[PDB]
């Protein structure tokens, strides 16, 4: 199998990722020549359907594929089949009686569920299903990956970068597939910020970034990685990609009990109504100012993703899924609509005071609180946070695409609103962690 160390072995090069050292030399060879699927959809495999947004996709394309009589196909990791249609099953078994009626609704005649790990040689499946695979999905739709953001980068490597290689495998043989992929705003930790657009390929504004021990710094290169390989795999064949950086992916307000409960943002809004207590502000002080969360909800960024993936349009598109506005909607503002809304929360001036008061009263949280809270985080809300007003990266891609595609009730990129802050609380409540 590739490894860390096969392809990487303190820095690493987007030239190290060459496909050679993934895909067989015959695979290769053979791709330039072959058909591209279909354009009419009837096929899709989703990995990730088990994770956050990757649920979210899988009624997208459960609907989407209820349209023309297709299959969705998911990925799901497990010791067997039937296992893996369980726990895909109880996924969306929430305490919402209208979302599991509609999926088992759609899952009856337009799903298949199979056992398998990306990071496994023909994605864990046998032969016959793998080449079955090869020979039918008309897209290949990825959110799949470890999302930790303490592990290195080599223990990533395997999931996240070498799974792609194993998706890519797939998507160059017998019929070159469509990809959409999920990236994150965390690769722009390393790229000067002029150079970090969505017209940029990845190789020239990203070549050579460092491997250490800094917050993401595995996980943000394990998602660079996977950039850097459909930019190898567009440039061999012409497959079409779609690169959708996110940035914090929020709860939404359609779908009860359905929270993202080890997320760093969960965590804070779940560790705020607990301990009752805030920060004067979450941001460098002049006066409390002007800030802006760079969060959109998951609903709208599954819509977005799958209506401007891959299967849209040829090419290779990068988007930011980024919410760009200077519209005040900050931190601060959050903790506002979490007291008015009956989570009473008190502000404790200085900042340095609150944070060693917040930490002793995380300690005191009972046990199922206290695990699901920031007190393993802490240690990044060690200094208040700079405030920008709109999002670090340009969007105007993203955007226009969205505006054209008329996606959502705005047709346009969302703002945040305190219906999302309070269905935080009402599904922190319905799954008992308040
Ligand atoms: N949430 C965010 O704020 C955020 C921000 C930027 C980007 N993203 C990106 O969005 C995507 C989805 O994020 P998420 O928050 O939905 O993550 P998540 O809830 O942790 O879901 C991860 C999914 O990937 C699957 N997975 C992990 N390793 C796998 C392997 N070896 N083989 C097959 N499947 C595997 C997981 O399966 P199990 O259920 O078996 O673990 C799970 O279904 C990721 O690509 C992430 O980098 C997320």
Same mark, same amino acid.
């Given at each position: 199998? @590739?490894? #860390?160390?096969?392809? /990487?072995?303190?820095?690493?090069?987007?030239?190290?990722?060459?496909?050679?050292?993934?895909?067989?030399? !015959?695979?290769?060879?053979?791709?330039?020549?072959? @058909?591209?699927?279909?354009?009419?959809?009837?096929?899709?495999?989703?990995?990730?359907?088990?994770?956050?947004?990757?649920?979210?996709?899988?009624?997208?394309?459960?609907?989407?594929?209820?349209?023309?009589?297709?299959?969705?196909?998911?990925?799901?990791?497990?010791?067997?089949?039937?296992?893996?249609?369980?726990?895909?099953?109880?996924?969306?078994?929430?305490?919402?009686?209208?979302?599991? +009626?509609?999926?088992?609704?759609? +899952?009856?005649?337009?799903?298949?569920?199979?056992?398998?790990?990306?990071?496994?040689?023909?994605?864990?499946?046998?032969?016959?299903? =793998?080449?079955?695979?090869?020979?039918?999905?008309? &897209?290949?739709?990825?959110?799949?990956?470890?999302?930790? /953001?303490?592990?290195?980068?080599?223990?990533?490597?395997?999931?996240?970068?070498?799974?792609?290689?194993?998706?890519?495998?797939?998507?160059?043989?017998?019929?070159?597939?469509?990809?959409?992929?999920?990236?994150? *705003?965390?690769?722009?930790?390393?790229?000067?910020?002029?150079?970090?657009?969505?017209?940029?390929? *990845?190789?020239?504004?990203?070549?050579?970034?460092?491997?250490?021990?800094?917050?993401?710094?595995?996980?943000?290169?394990?998602?660079?990685?996977?950039?850097? &390989?459909?930019?190898? !795999?567009?440039?061999?064949?012409?497959?079409?990609?779609?690169?959708?950086?996110?940035?914090?992916?929020?709860?939404?307000?359609?779908?009860?009990?359905?929270?993202?409960?080890?997320?760093?943002?969960?965590?804070?809004?779940?560790?705020?109504?607990?301990?009752?207590?805030?920060?004067?502000?979450?941001?460098?002080?002049?006066?409390?100012?002007?800030? /802006?969360?760079?969060?959109?909800?998951?609903? #709208?960024?599954?819509?977005?993703?799958?209506?401007?993936?891959?299967?849209?349009?040829?090419? #290779?598109?990068?988007?930011?899924?980024?919410?760009?506005?200077?519209?005040?909607?900050? $931190?601060?503002?959050?903790?506002?609509?979490?007291?008015?809304?009956?989570?009473?929360?008190?502000?404790?001036?200085?900042?340095?005071? =609150?944070?060693?008061? #917040?930490?002793?009263? $995380?300690?005191?949280?009972?046990?199922?609180?206290?695990?699901?809270?920031?007190?393993?985080?802490?240690?990044?809300?060690?200094?208040?946070?700079?405030?920008?007003?709109?999002? *670090? +990266?340009?969007?105007?891609?993203?955007? !226009?695409?969205?505006?054209?595609?008329?996606?959502? @009730?705005?047709?346009?990129?969302?703002?945040?609103? +305190?219906?999302? *802050?309070?269905?935080?609380?009402?599904?922190?409540?319905?799954?008992?962690?308040?």
């Amino acid at each position: 199998r @590739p490894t #860390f160390a096969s392809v /990487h072995g303190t820095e690493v090069h987007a030239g190290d990722l060459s496909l050679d050292k993934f895909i067989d030399a !015959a695979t290769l060879a053979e791709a330039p020549r072959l @058909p591209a699927a279909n354009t009419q959809v009837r096929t899709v495999l989703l990995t990730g359907a088990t994770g956050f947004l990757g649920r979210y996709l899988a009624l997208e394309w459960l609907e989407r594929m209820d349209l023309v009589d297709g299959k969705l196909i998911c990925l799901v990791r497990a010791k067997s089949d039937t296992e893996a249609r369980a726990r895909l099953d109880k996924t969306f078994d929430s305490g919402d009686p209208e979302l599991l +009626a509609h999926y088992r609704a759609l +899952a009856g005649d337009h799903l298949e569920v199979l056992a398998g790990d990306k990071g496994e040689a023909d994605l864990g499946l046998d032969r016959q299903t =793998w080449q079955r695979l090869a020979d039918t999905v008309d &897209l290949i739709v990825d959110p799949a990956a470890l999302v930790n /953001h303490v592990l290195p980068y080599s223990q990533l490597f395997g999931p996240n970068a070498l799974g792609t290689a194993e998706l890519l495998r797939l998507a160059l043989t017998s019929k070159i597939k469509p990809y959409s992929y999920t990236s994150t *705003i965390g690769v722009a930790d390393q790229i000067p910020p002029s150079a970090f657009t969505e017209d940029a390929d *990845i190789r020239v504004i990203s070549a050579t970034r460092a491997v250490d021990d800094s917050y993401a710094n595995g996980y943000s290169n394990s998602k660079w990685a996977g950039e850097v &390989l459909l930019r190898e !795999a567009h440039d061999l064949c012409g497959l079409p990609v779609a690169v959708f950086r996110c940035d914090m992916i929020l709860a939404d307000t359609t779908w009860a009990g359905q929270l993202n409960v080890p997320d760093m943002f969960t965590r804070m809004i779940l560790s705020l109504a607990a301990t009752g207590i805030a920060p004067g502000s979450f941001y460098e002080l002049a006066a409390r100012q002007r800030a /802006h969360y760079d969060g959109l909800p998951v609903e #709208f960024i599954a819509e977005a993703i799958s209506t401007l993936g891959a299967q849209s349009q040829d090419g #290779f598109h990068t988007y930011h899924v980024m919410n760009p506005y200077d519209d005040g909607i900050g $931190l601060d503002e959050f903790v506002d609509w979490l007291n008015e809304s009956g989570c009473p929360i008190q502000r404790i001036a200085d900042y340095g005071d =609150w944070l060693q008061r #917040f930490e002793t009263a $995380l300690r005191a949280l009972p046990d199922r609180q206290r695990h699901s809270s920031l007190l393993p985080l802490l240690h990044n809300y060690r200094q208040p946070e700079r405030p920008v007003r709109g999002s *670090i +990266a340009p969007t105007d891609r993203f955007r !226009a695409a969205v505006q054209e595609a008329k996606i959502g @009730p705005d047709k346009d990129i969302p703002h945040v609103g +305190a219906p999302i *802050i309070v269905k935080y609380v009402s599904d922190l409540r319905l799954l008992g962690l308040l």
